[PDB]
Design a protein around this motif. Structure first.
Motif, PDB file in Angstrom:
ATOM      1  N   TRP A  35       0.800  -1.215   0.000  1.00 48.24           N
ATOM      2  CA  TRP A  35       0.000   0.000   0.000  1.00 48.24           C
ATOM      3  C   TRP A  35       0.836   1.270   0.000  1.00 48.24           C
ATOM      4  CZ3 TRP A  35       0.027  -3.558   4.046  1.00 48.24           C
ATOM      5  CH2 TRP A  35       0.698  -3.158   5.209  1.00 48.24           C
ATOM      6  N   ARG A  54      -0.589  -7.964   6.802  1.00 51.10           N
ATOM      7  CA  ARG A  54      -2.034  -8.147   6.685  1.00 51.10           C
ATOM      8  C   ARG A  54      -2.570  -9.066   7.780  1.00 51.10           C
ATOM      9  NH1 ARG A  54      -3.401  -5.958   1.482  1.00 51.10           N
ATOM     10  NH2 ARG A  54      -1.361  -5.207   0.769  1.00 51.10           N
TER      11      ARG A  54
ATOM     12  N   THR C  20      -8.632 -21.202   6.092  1.00 50.24           N
ATOM     13  CA  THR C  20      -8.524 -21.475   4.666  1.00 50.24           C
ATOM     14  C   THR C  20      -8.573 -20.161   3.900  1.00 50.24           C
ATOM     15  OG1 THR C  20     -10.920 -21.845   4.529  1.00 50.24           O
ATOM     16  CG2 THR C  20      -9.511 -23.788   4.792  1.00 50.24           C
ATOM     17  N   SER C  22      -9.620 -18.125   0.756  1.00 50.10           N
ATOM     18  CA  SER C  22     -10.661 -18.193  -0.257  1.00 50.10           C
ATOM     19  C   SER C  22     -10.596 -16.968  -1.159  1.00 50.10           C
ATOM     20  CB  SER C  22     -12.052 -18.294   0.381  1.00 50.10           C
ATOM     21  OG  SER C  22     -12.572 -17.011   0.678  1.00 50.10           O
ATOM     22  N   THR C  24     -12.914 -14.547  -3.666  1.00 51.59           N
ATOM     23  CA  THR C  24     -14.273 -14.122  -3.968  1.00 51.59           C
ATOM     24  C   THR C  24     -14.280 -13.297  -5.248  1.00 51.59           C
ATOM     25  OG1 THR C  24     -14.631 -13.992  -1.576  1.00 51.59           O
ATOM     26  CG2 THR C  24     -16.363 -13.120  -3.000  1.00 51.59           C
TER      27      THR C  24
ATOM     28  N   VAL D  39      -8.099  -2.648  -3.069  1.00 53.72           N
ATOM     29  CA  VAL D  39      -6.911  -2.902  -3.880  1.00 53.72           C
ATOM     30  C   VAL D  39      -5.740  -2.037  -3.435  1.00 53.72           C
ATOM     31  CG1 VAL D  39      -5.950  -2.740  -6.197  1.00 53.72           C
ATOM     32  CG2 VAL D  39      -8.228  -3.719  -5.866  1.00 53.72           C
ATOM     33  N   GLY D  41      -4.529  -0.930  -0.797  1.00 55.85           N
ATOM     34  CA  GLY D  41      -4.361  -1.052   0.632  1.00 55.85           C
ATOM     35  C   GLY D  41      -5.294  -2.093   1.199  1.00 55.85           C
ATOM     36  N   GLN D  42      -5.426  -2.087   2.522  1.00 55.67           N
ATOM     37  CA  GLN D  42      -6.310  -2.998   3.233  1.00 55.67           C
ATOM     38  C   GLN D  42      -7.466  -2.210   3.830  1.00 55.67           C
ATOM     39  OE1 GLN D  42      -4.659  -4.942   6.685  1.00 55.67           O
ATOM     40  NE2 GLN D  42      -6.078  -6.676   6.551  1.00 55.67           N
ATOM     41  N   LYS D  44     -10.678  -1.858   6.288  1.00 50.52           N
ATOM     42  CA  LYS D  44     -11.221  -2.378   7.535  1.00 50.52           C
ATOM     43  C   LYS D  44     -12.735  -2.531   7.505  1.00 50.52           C
ATOM     44  CE  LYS D  44     -10.081  -3.249  10.997  1.00 50.52           C
ATOM     45  NZ  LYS D  44      -9.673  -4.435  11.800  1.00 50.52           N
ATOM     46  N   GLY D  50     -15.690  -8.553   0.035  1.00 50.21           N
ATOM     47  CA  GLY D  50     -15.919  -9.982   0.037  1.00 50.21           C
ATOM     48  C   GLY D  50     -16.241 -10.507   1.427  1.00 50.21           C
ATOM     49  N   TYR D  53     -12.635 -11.837   6.475  1.00 48.35           N
ATOM     50  CA  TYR D  53     -11.645 -10.801   6.742  1.00 48.35           C
ATOM     51  C   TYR D  53     -10.816 -10.545   5.489  1.00 48.35           C
ATOM     52  CZ  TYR D  53     -12.914 -12.032  11.529  1.00 48.35           C
ATOM     53  OH  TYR D  53     -13.607 -12.294  12.689  1.00 48.35           O
ATOM     54  N   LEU D  55      -7.949  -9.457   3.051  1.00 50.80           N
ATOM     55  CA  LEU D  55      -6.498  -9.319   3.061  1.00 50.80           C
ATOM     56  C   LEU D  55      -6.012  -8.431   1.923  1.00 50.80           C
ATOM     57  CD1 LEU D  55      -5.629 -13.053   3.839  1.00 50.80           C
ATOM     58  CD2 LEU D  55      -5.220 -11.121   5.377  1.00 50.80           C
ATOM     59  N   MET D  56      -6.350  -8.776   0.684  1.00 56.95           N
ATOM     60  CA  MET D  56      -6.009  -7.970  -0.482  1.00 56.95           C
ATOM     61  C   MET D  56      -6.909  -8.396  -1.635  1.00 56.95           C
ATOM     62  SD  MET D  56      -2.493  -9.906  -0.496  1.00 56.95           S
ATOM     63  CE  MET D  56      -1.432  -9.151  -1.722  1.00 56.95           C
ATOM     64  N   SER D  57      -6.751  -7.720  -2.771  1.00 55.63           N
ATOM     65  CA  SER D  57      -7.507  -8.047  -3.969  1.00 55.63           C
ATOM     66  C   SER D  57      -6.643  -7.778  -5.192  1.00 55.63           C
ATOM     67  CB  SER D  57      -8.813  -7.248  -4.048  1.00 55.63           C
ATOM     68  OG  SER D  57      -8.652  -5.955  -3.495  1.00 55.63           O
ATOM     69  N   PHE D  58      -6.904  -8.530  -6.257  1.00 59.98           N
ATOM     70  CA  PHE D  58      -6.159  -8.410  -7.511  1.00 59.98           C
ATOM     71  C   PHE D  58      -7.100  -7.971  -8.623  1.00 59.98           C
ATOM     72  CE2 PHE D  58      -3.891 -11.795  -5.127  1.00 59.98           C
ATOM     73  CZ  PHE D  58      -2.708 -11.114  -4.917  1.00 59.98           C
ATOM     74  N   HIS D  70     -10.656 -10.837  -4.855  1.00 62.30           N
ATOM     75  CA  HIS D  70     -10.412 -10.591  -3.442  1.00 62.30           C
ATOM     76  C   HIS D  70      -9.785 -11.809  -2.776  1.00 62.30           C
ATOM     77  CE1 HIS D  70     -12.822  -6.921  -3.725  1.00 62.30           C
ATOM     78  NE2 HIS D  70     -13.748  -7.632  -4.343  1.00 62.30           N
ATOM     79  N   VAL D  71      -8.865 -11.555  -1.851  1.00 61.07           N
ATOM     80  CA  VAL D  71      -8.260 -12.592  -1.024  1.00 61.07           C
ATOM     81  C   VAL D  71      -8.771 -12.382   0.394  1.00 61.07           C
ATOM     82  CG1 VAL D  71      -6.135 -13.550  -0.098  1.00 61.07           C
ATOM     83  CG2 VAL D  71      -6.240 -12.830  -2.492  1.00 61.07           C
ATOM     84  N   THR D  72      -9.537 -13.344   0.896  1.00 59.23           N
ATOM     85  CA  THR D  72     -10.187 -13.237   2.191  1.00 59.23           C
ATOM     86  C   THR D  72      -9.530 -14.186   3.190  1.00 59.23           C
ATOM     87  OG1 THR D  72     -11.882 -14.740   1.337  1.00 59.23           O
ATOM     88  CG2 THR D  72     -12.377 -12.383   1.329  1.00 59.23           C
ATOM     89  N   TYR D  73      -9.995 -14.111   4.435  1.00 55.22           N
ATOM     90  CA  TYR D  73      -9.476 -14.924   5.534  1.00 55.22           C
ATOM     91  C   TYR D  73     -10.671 -15.472   6.306  1.00 55.22           C
ATOM     92  CZ  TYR D  73      -6.862 -16.298   9.716  1.00 55.22           C
ATOM     93  OH  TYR D  73      -6.320 -17.000  10.769  1.00 55.22           O
ATOM     94  N   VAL D  74     -11.032 -16.723   6.035  1.00 56.47           N
ATOM     95  CA  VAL D  74     -12.170 -17.379   6.664  1.00 56.47           C
ATOM     96  C   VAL D  74     -11.651 -18.571   7.460  1.00 56.47           C
ATOM     97  CG1 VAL D  74     -12.661 -18.718   4.549  1.00 56.47           C
ATOM     98  CG2 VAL D  74     -14.405 -18.504   6.341  1.00 56.47           C
TER      99      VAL D  74
END
Ligand SMILES: *[C@@H]1O[C@H](CO)[C@@H](O[C@@H]2O[C@H](CO)[C@@H](O)[C@H](O)[C@H]2NC(C)=O)[C@H](O)[C@H]1NC(C)=O
Ligand SMILES: *[C@@H]1O[C@H](CO)[C@@H](O[C@@H]2O[C@H](CO)[C@@H](O)[C@H](O)[C@H]2NC(C)=O)[C@H](O)[C@H]1NC(C)=O
Ligand SMILES: *[C@@H]1O[C@H](CO)[C@@H](O[C@@H]2O[C@H](CO)[C@@H](O)[C@H](O)[C@H]2NC(C)=O)[C@H](O)[C@H]1NC(C)=O
Ligand SMILES: *[C@@H]1O[C@H](CO)[C@@H](O[C@@H]2O[C@H](CO)[C@@H](O)[C@H](O)[C@H]2NC(C)=O)[C@H](O)[C@H]1NC(C)=O
Ligand SMILES: *[C@@H]1O[C@H](CO)[C@@H](O[C@@H]2O[C@H](CO)[C@@H](O)[C@H](O)[C@H]2NC(C)=O)[C@H](O)[C@H]1NC(C)=O
Ligand SMILES: *[C@@H]1O[C@H](CO)[C@@H](O[C@@H]2O[C@H](CO)[C@@H](O)[C@H](O)[C@H]2NC(C)=O)[C@H](O)[C@H]1NC(C)=O
Ligand SMILES: *[C@@H]1O[C@H](CO)[C@@H](O)[C@H](O)[C@H]1NC(C)=O
Ligand SMILES: *[C@@H]1O[C@H](CO)[C@@H](O)[C@H](O)[C@H]1NC(C)=O
Ligand SMILES: *[C@@H]1O[C@H](CO)[C@@H](O)[C@H](O)[C@H]1NC(C)=O
Ligand SMILES: *[C@@H]1O[C@H](CO)[C@@H](O)[C@H](O)[C@H]1NC(C)=O
Ligand SMILES: *[C@@H]1O[C@H](CO)[C@@H](O)[C@H](O)[C@H]1NC(C)=O
Ligand SMILES: *[C@@H]1O[C@H](CO)[C@@H](O)[C@H](O)[C@H]1NC(C)=O
Lengths: 90, 162, 98, 152, 147
Positions: A35, A54, C20, C22, C24, D39, D41-42, D44, D50, D53, D55-58, D70-74
């Motif tokens: 960022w 992160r 995990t 994921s 989206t 994208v 940054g992160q 909140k 998505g 939680y 994390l980032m997105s491409f 999007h890259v998430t944290y589940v």
């Protein structure tokens, strides 16, 4: 076509190659700087350290990323393969 | 009347398209298929360098096919194309702008999306800042405009009761 | 949805021990095809008499042309605030060891 | 008659195109905000970039649009634990600084809230505030006090 | 004929005014949100109250509109360094609590994210977690233990 009756179509200002170039530049910035490039000059950073930052942002300690880094990398690669395969299947 | 590559039935002697327009007709003099295409048309456009900068202008065509440079957004005349790329200021379309640059004459070139710079990436290298500058960014956001009231009785009617 | 009951107690907690990663997918359009339509070619063909009655509707034609030009300019601008966030392009490093 | 008929159709098409352009502007503003936050940054904002939680997105180029990877944290696996809000040691109330008290069957540990990692309760991960009577659900335990073996 | 023409003229202006009013309402909602976030507090949304790290914004009166004088935090000068995600001392891996391990060539320090301020690695700015046989990248060093 739909141009024979005076309904001319304006070509876009930004061609698809330039949109692809913009997306590639943004991807390179977000994988090489995180960022910092989005809020000023670009600052280099390794990707595991960005992942640890992160992880600290979402409330998890940074040591759990380095303890199973191979597992997280394999999960990310599997997720990328999964989204590519599901996208190939509108 | 272009020479077509599609053959027809032996009795029909006409043609149509998806938009339901007669764009094909046989010539029964020799049973030759011929296409129909509408004539060239479009609108002219003017590229102006600006007030108190220059006087000469350029003429731009939207979709008319032809000093003179054939762009992807039509036909451009009066502007000399140059291979080098800068940051453009007057949009044209199809990835090319026009600008006034060094005497000095109007030129057309592909835009530059930014400064081509490569960042150094390593697994054990970072760039931590040691100084900062306080900057102020100005943003303009309108919230309202003039409030007008329109009544028919005084507008569509004058001083007549009919 | 699925009918399930979550157990609640004043001295019971549930914390995760595994996670995990994921991905989206979200689809968000930003622009579309830009079309300019004029009254001279659509309403009229190749007849002068059709244009002789168009001077009483040149005002609405000007309004429609201005609206279409504004739509085209707006659509051209819409791409700028989404993709051109940075004015420096960044080349990808030749090393792919991430 | 023909031109008066065609004016209405042209006006209706123009109004429909204007409504579509307004919707396109709203979608483009939403996409620009998403690109600036998730994208660049992160973000909140929960359930904005998505599910889970973020994390980032491409971002990737699309014909007449944009997409975000999007890259998430589940979390996947969860457990059950008995927890206490405070712990009493010597007439003092100890509260976790960056954790939560949990016990499996007989031993009480302090772990982070979003991941399971048991640690021994000492004076470095707990802070003393108040007495034992104020807290309702207080639990007796002993504090390690790591300074004591070191000073010997 | 005159009445029909004037009514046809009067409807398009109403439609255009309604569309412009909807656009003005959307812009006013965006401006009110920006006011309530960037002015009435500190917004953590990156690239929302201007380019850079937003601190505060000063609203000013404008004719039929509003402007915001955002105060942003951007870096100016940066320096390159050699970094390590962890450090082993004696069978124990030390991780930085609120810092990063930076090196100048023969020593190691701890520094913040957006500013440079070297310090000395000790048992107060680092926490232990496991052994050093699990971290892929580690560099040998020692801690102070000030007691
Ligand atoms: C950080 O940048 C500021 C801005 O340039 C520096 O302040 C300048 O310092 C020089 C020399 O010390 C002075 O001649 C200028 O008048 C200063 N300008 C302002 C606006 O104060 C500052 O020195 C820099 N700090 C470091 C550590 O490099
Ligand atoms: C957390 O979940 C991951 C994903 O299922 C687990 O990784 C799997 O582990 C098994 C056995 O160790 C392997 O057979 C699989 O190939 C792994 N999958 C992947 C994608 O790597 C991991 O073991 C789980 N961790 C815990 C503590 O339960
Ligand atoms: C709760 O957790 C503690 C710590 O993990 C367990 O205590 C250990 O139990 C093993 C199993 O016999 C022993 O080998 C260790 O010596 C114990 N450690 C200590 C410090 O006493 C405890 O057994 C667990 N209790 C239950 C019911 O699972
Ligand atoms: C937790 O510890 C406190 C004090 O060590 C216990 O309080 C004592 O309770 C006994 C009988 O329950 C009384 O005779 C003492 O006078 C109490 N002492 C104090 C200082 O209050 C308390 O009972 C313990 N709680 C549990 C669940 O064992
Ligand atoms: C790297 O950092 C170390 C620690 O600050 C530097 O070592 C000190 O350098 C100063 C400058 O002359 C001396 O006065 C101290 O005596 C040094 N201390 C020790 C323990 O060596 C070192 O010089 C720095 N190296 C570079 C290349 O900048
Ligand atoms: C960092 O320290 C470790 C342990 O202090 C070093 O590992 C030793 O390496 C030597 C030879 O390289 C072996 O003979 C020992 O058996 C190793 N000990 C252990 C506990 O692994 C390691 O080499 C050091 N790294 C550097 C770069 O000096
Ligand atoms: C324009 O016309 C010339 C000659 O008539 C022709 O060579 C050229 O291919 C045409 N351009 C396009 C894009 O068809
Ligand atoms: C620009 O340079 C290229 C380089 O090969 C050349 O092909 C082209 O003719 C040049 N353009 C002009 C207008 O001279
Ligand atoms: C284990 O977790 C389940 C979650 O549904 C809970 O109902 C159960 O009470 C837990 N076990 C104990 C011994 O508390
Ligand atoms: C939890 O609630 C039950 C039922 O009301 C009660 O018996 C028990 O004492 C409570 N425990 C705590 C720690 O409040
Ligand atoms: C630091 O050094 C590397 C290579 O040694 C170089 O690529 C990078 O640009 C340098 N950083 C700065 C801020 O000069
Ligand atoms: C960094 O990457 C290079 C190239 O693969 C490798 O030789 C080096 O060992 C790596 N260093 C670390 C600390 O991973």
């Amino acid at each position: 076509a739909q141009k024979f009756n005076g309904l001319t179509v304006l070509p876009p200002l930004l061609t698809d190659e330039m949109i692809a170039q913009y997306t590639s530049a943004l991807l390179a910035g977000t994988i090489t700087s995180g960022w910092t490039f989005g809020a000023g000059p670009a600052l280099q950073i390794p990707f595991p350290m960005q992942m640890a930052y992160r992880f600290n942002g979402i409330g998890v300690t940074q040591n759990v990323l380095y303890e199973n880094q191979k597992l997280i990398a394999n999960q990310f690669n599997s997720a990328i393969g999964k989204i590519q395969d599901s996208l190939s299947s509108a | 009347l272009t020479e077509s590559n599609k053959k027809f039935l032996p009795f029909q002697q006409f043609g149509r398209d998806i938009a339901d327009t007669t764009d094909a007709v046989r010539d029964p003099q020799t049973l030759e298929i011929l296409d129909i295409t509408p004539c060239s048309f479009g609108g002219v456009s003017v590229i102006t360098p600006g007030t108190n900068t220059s006087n000469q202008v350029a003429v731009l065509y939207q979709d008319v096919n032809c000093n003179v440079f054939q762009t992807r957004a039509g036909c451009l005349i009066g502007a000399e194309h140059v291979n080098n790329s800068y940051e453009c200021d007057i949009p044209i379309g199809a990835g090319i702008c026009a600008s006034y640059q060094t005497s000095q004459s109007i030129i057309a070139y592909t835009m530059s999306l930014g400064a081509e710079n490569s960042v150094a990436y390593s697994n054990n290298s970072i760039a931590i800042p040691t100084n900062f500058t306080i900057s102020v960014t100005t943003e303009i956001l309108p919230v309202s405009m003039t409030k007008t009231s329109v009544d028919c009785t005084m507008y569509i009617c004058g001083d007549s009761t009919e | 949805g699925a009918e399930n009951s979550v157990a609640y107690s004043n001295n019971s907690i549930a914390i995760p021990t595994n996670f995990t990663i994921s991905v989206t997918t979200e689809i968000l359009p930003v622009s579309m095809t830009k079309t300019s339509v004029d009254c001279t070619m659509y309403i009229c063909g190749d007849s002068t008499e059709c244009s002789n009655l168009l001077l009483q509707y040149g005002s609405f034609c000007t309004q429609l042309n201005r609206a279409l030009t504004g739509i085209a300019v707006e659509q051209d601008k819409n791409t700028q605030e989404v993709f051109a966030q940075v004015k420096q392009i960044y080349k990808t490093p030749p090393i792919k060891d991430f | 008659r023909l031109i008066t008929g065609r004016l209405q159709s042209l006006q209706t098409y123009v109004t429909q195109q204007l409504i579509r352009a307004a919707e396109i502007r709203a979608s483009a503003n939403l996409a620009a905000t998403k690109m600036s936050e998730c994208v660049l940054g992160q973000s909140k904002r929960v359930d904005f970039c998505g599910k889970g939680y973020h994390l980032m997105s491409f971002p990737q180029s699309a014909p007449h649009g944009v997409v975000f990877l999007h890259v998430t944290y589940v979390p996947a696996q969860e457990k059950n634990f008995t927890t206490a809000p405070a712990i009493c040691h010597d007439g003092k109330a100890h509260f976790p600084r960056e954790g939560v008290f949990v016990s499996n069957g007989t031993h009480w540990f302090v772990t982070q809230r979003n991941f399971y990692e048991p640690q021994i309760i000492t004076t470095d991960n707990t802070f003393v505030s108040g007495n034992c009577d104020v807290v309702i659900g207080i639990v007796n335990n002993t504090v390690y006090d790591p300074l004591q073996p070191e000073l010997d």
